[PDB]
Amino acid sequence: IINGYEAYTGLFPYQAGLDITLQDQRRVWCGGSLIDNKWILTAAHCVHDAVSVVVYLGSAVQYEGEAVVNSERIISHSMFNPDTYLNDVALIKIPHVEYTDNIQPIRLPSGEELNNKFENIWATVSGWGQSNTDTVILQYTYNLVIDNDRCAQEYPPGIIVESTICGDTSDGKSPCFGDSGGPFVLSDKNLLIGVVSFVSGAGCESGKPVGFSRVTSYMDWIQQNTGIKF
Amino acid sequence: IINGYEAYTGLFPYQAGLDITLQDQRRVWCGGSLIDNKWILTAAHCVHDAVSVVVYLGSAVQYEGEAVVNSERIISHSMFNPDTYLNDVALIKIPHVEYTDNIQPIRLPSGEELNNKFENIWATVSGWGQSNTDTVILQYTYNLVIDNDRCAQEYPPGIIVESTICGDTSDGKSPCFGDSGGPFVLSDKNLLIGVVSFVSGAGCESGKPVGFSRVTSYMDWIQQNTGIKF
Amino acid sequence: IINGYEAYTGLFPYQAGLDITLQDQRRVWCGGSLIDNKWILTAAHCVHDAVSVVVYLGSAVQYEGEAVVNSERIISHSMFNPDTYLNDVALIKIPHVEYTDNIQPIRLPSGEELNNKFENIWATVSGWGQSNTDTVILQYTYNLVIDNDRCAQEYPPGIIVESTICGDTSDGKSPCFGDSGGPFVLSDKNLLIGVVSFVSGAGCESGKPVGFSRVTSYMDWIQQNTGIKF
Amino acid sequence: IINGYEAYTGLFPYQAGLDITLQDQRRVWCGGSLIDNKWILTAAHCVHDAVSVVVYLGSAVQYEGEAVVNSERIISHSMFNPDTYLNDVALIKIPHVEYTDNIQPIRLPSGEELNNKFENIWATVSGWGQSNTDTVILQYTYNLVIDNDRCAQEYPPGIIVESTICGDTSDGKSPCFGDSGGPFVLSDKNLLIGVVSFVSGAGCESGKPVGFSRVTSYMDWIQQNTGIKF
């Protein structure tokens, strides 16, 4: 997060930290959200060629958690497109973790929240990605969600689609690399509206909108692959 | 490093820490060796699809350094093969750093050292890869370099080639994920003989050899690309 | 607030900003909390010799509000002691303001929350007092509440009493001058637990605890002087 | 200033902005005049119970300055009377500031100017006190200095004394709360003749005279305390 603030343990009980080992032996960090005792939602670009993930839950300190579990299964959206970031969602199945003061699930949109585009709302994004700081402590910031038409002007033709939700970064506050897969939340409603997907090619301090996977567009996929009806 | 010893600043003044941003926006960690005031040597598998790298020099603490510079260019070996890890070597051009007590170059082989296979010598591996502890301090271990014929037996056919050098990990002291690109050095002679390239398909705690790029096999490529003679 | 973060309009809908004119003609700034359509809770040291207060509601920008009203009555606790800061609470009666997305009351402790000392809880304090920054934007930070016995060791004998609630500032994050009267809130419960009362004589960056009026100790006084049973 | 004109940086290079912290911890704003590289002249009613002051020099924006220094000492007039505002003058010692285009001293009266009562001249008042607009830019206005006998009639007995100088505000252009301590100057002669001291009990928009400390009555006190001759 660039120009973010430090969270304490317990501020964002749904935040997951993912230490990912890939097929080519590299170690990747991404964020994710606890959506169920057995499930983490993250981005497909984080884990589509992963071999294993260690999931950290319940601490603001990177690589610490009061629950550290290993993934049992990784489900990346079959139609994820690497080149456009279309369908950039994935599910990590974990061993049942018991909720706690520090570990709690985020709510997913139901009912008519499924028809809300959330324009002009301030939402919270959090993660341990590149920051201007030193810190190993979970950071967060607020980005206002803008409408898709305004957002589509900022990127090549075809990148911003119905299933993308963009956040404005023109105050210089932004997700940055390593924040991928992280939660974009309507705090007041404890609602997950987006999964961090992509930053502009111009970089994290460009003032360009950040693209997120719009969670209402993937609630069928989630329902269906987890077998849980939210 | 699994079951290594804890280093401290100044112990390994040639060690570079590399925070890599890939073309797909993921954040990767690898190590490297300072070989000149403007050049880092590392693995092609770390950076072959990289867009920029922050280089940390002179501190044993991960993401800390008395010099923190950004890559000016990345030359990856054009014949690198991802599937076999053949020709796994890359160069990061950086802005001229001045050597201090904590930042010094490692010698590269030359003359008759170019003909030495270094069989059955203890060499030192260092890095911030997966250990048994969640630690941010640089770790190191000593591994015995074995002969290629002995190493080859431990791998698929054709993985161990003339340009591979192997270190025995049968005491369970091993490089692991994240140590990629790191230096394999003859401490007494302050000589770089290998760059960490690949762990066994069996993982890190299997007692199996680790392969490294044999630096003596790439000294031409290094002088061609850097423009300097060693 | 020192080392605080910026709020946006709507983050803290209960925050009041008070532009106070005193009996000696000086202009003082303090914060306060909207506890009812007609009532603001603040500190007695802010307003005990005030003549009028302009109350700003509904904006993070200082001296702006979507409701700017003038006080009708100021009620400072009759037993406020200037020298020890004992009983440092006051009520400002305002013209009925209609709640809004941006203007909402904070809850006051009821039931057995009246018996909770709130030790070891992270709470949020906010205001437009001295900061290290430039900003005219409402700032906030988090301070952990410590127990009174630990807190009493940090001040002269007799300052910390049953009706004081202290917040720890040893990470360098603190209320500072101008934050007086401001809210100390359990965000999760939308609960007002303290009113900013005093900073150490050593100043805002001393690492000493900050004293607040413990709101459970004044719920009778509030009930009684507002005539509202919370 | 009610109904004043908007200044800009460099227009009033002698104007100081004072952010005062009182002994009771409240944050107060007053203005002052730069009279030497190490001295601010202001009102005793602003700082007589002050503990420290941040001094803003060289910017028309409130809490901005090309020089921002902290008070080294505050000398308040020992005979100041709060109730009558008698002897309302104070000195803030600051670290030597170098005069620039935006920071310059104002001349103090001397020789025969010490005998001039300055009746019926237009002088300029400036400050960041209450205006009709919520603005952070320095405001100014011209007020006609009237004779003490005429001023006295507009106040209680004994408030207007030999050391008071009054400015007429009957066009509704008036200093107001927050302008305290500010300069009252003969622009054409760049001469300081008054320090804003008190507004009428009727308020700022009443058309009543404003009292100022007559600087010619305190030129001895100023040289005694600063140690400099004018």
Contact D108, D14 (CB under 8 A): no
H/E segment holding residue C163: none
DSSP state, residue D23: T
Contact C144, C207 (CB under 8 A): no
Q: Do D27 and C82 touch (CB under 8 A)?
A: no
Chain C: residues touching D (Cβ < 8 Å): 21, 24-30, 45-46, 63-64, 82, 129-130, 134, 136, 177-178, 180, 198-199
Q: Do C122 and A11 touch (CB under 8 A)?
A: yes
Of C88, C42, C83, C119, nearest to C201 by C-alpha is C83
Give the number of A-C residue pairs with CB atoms closer than 8 Å.
13
- SS3 of residue B57 by DSSP: strand
Which of C27, C136, C199 lies at the smallest CB-CB distance from D28? Answer: C27
Which positions ≥6 away from A125 have C-beta within 8 Å?
A1, A140, A141, A142, A143, A167, A175, A179, A182, A183, A184, A185, A194, A196, A210
Distance CA A54, CA A34 (A): 14
**End-to-end CA separation in angstroms for chain A:** 29
**Residue tagged active-site, from B36, B59, B88, B168:** B88
Which of D25, D45, D177 lies at the smallest CB-CB distance from C177? Answer: D25
Which of D27, D82, D178 lies at the smallest CB-CB distance from C130? Answer: D27
Chain C: residues touching A (Cβ < 8 Å): 5, 8, 10-11, 122, 142, 144
DSSP state, residue C37: T
Nearest residue of A to residue C121, measured between CA atoms: A10
Determine how β-strand C27-36 pairs with β-strand B210-214. Answer: unpaired
Distance CA C82, CA C157 (A): 16
**What resolution, expressed in A, was reported for this entry?**
1.8
Q: E-strand spans in chain B?
A: 5-6, 15-22, 27-36, 39-42, 50-57, 67-70, 73-76, 90-93, 122-127, 139-146, 164-168, 183-186, 191-198, 210-214
H/E segment holding residue B7: none
Concerning whether B77 is annotated as a catalytic residue, the answer is: no
Concerning whether A180 is annotated as a catalytic residue, the answer is: yes
Nearest residue of C to residue A5, measured between CA atoms: C5
**End-to-end CA separation in angstroms for chain D:** 30
Chain D nearest-CA distance from C28, in A, is 5
H/E segment holding residue B9: none
DSSP state, residue D128: S
Chain C interface, best mutation among A1, A3, A5, by max C CB count within 10 A: A5
Beta-carbon neighbour count of residue B120 at 10 Å? 10
**Residue tagged active-site, from A33, A36, A71, A88:** A88
Nearest residue of C to residue A121, measured between CA atoms: C10
Contact C222, C42 (CB under 8 A): no
Concerning whether D180 is annotated as a catalytic residue, the answer is: yes
Which of A27, A64, A199 lies at the smallest CB-CB distance from B28? Answer: A27
H/E segment holding residue D91: strand D90-93
Nearest residue of C to residue A4, measured between CA atoms: C5
Active site residues per annotation of C: 45, 88, 180
Which of D26, D82, D129 lies at the smallest CB-CB distance from C28? Answer: D26
Chain A: residues touching B (Cβ < 8 Å): 21, 24-30, 45-46, 63-64, 82, 129-130, 134, 136, 177-178, 180, 198-199
Tokens 């909770």 belong to: C116
**Angle (CA) A45 A10 A132, round 5°:** 55
Q: Which domains does chain D have, with CATH numbers?
A: 1-14+107-218 (2.40.10.10), 15-106+219-230 (2.40.10.10)
- Which residues in chain D touch residue C199, judged by CB atoms under 8 angstroms apart? 25
Distance CA A221, CA D41 (A): 72
DSSP chain A: -BS-EE--TTSSTTEEEEEEEETTS-EEEEEEEEEETTEEEE-HHHHTTEEEEEEEES-SBTT--SEEEE-SEEEE-TT-BTTTTBT--EEEE-S----BTTB-PPB---GGGGG---TT-EEEEEESS--SS---B-EEEEEEE--HHHHHTTS-TTSS-TTEEEEE-TTS-B--TT-TT-EEEEGGGTEEEEEEEE--TT-TTS-PPEEEEEGGGGHHHHHHHH----
- SS3 of residue C152 by DSSP: helix
DSSP B82-141: TTTTBT--EEEE---PPP-SS--PPB---GGGGG---TT-EEEEEESS--SS---B-EEE
Chain A nearest-CA distance from B50, in A, is 12
Of D85, D84, D67, D68, nearest to D76 by C-alpha is D85
Chains C and B touch (3+ CB pairs under 8 A): no
Q: Do D24 and C178 touch (CB under 8 A)?
A: no
User: B86-104: string of b/e by CB count within 10 Å (b at 16+)?
Assistant: bbbbbbbebeebeeeebbe
Nearest residue of A to residue C3, measured between CA atoms: A5
Half-sphere exposure of C67 (CA within 13 A, CB side): 23
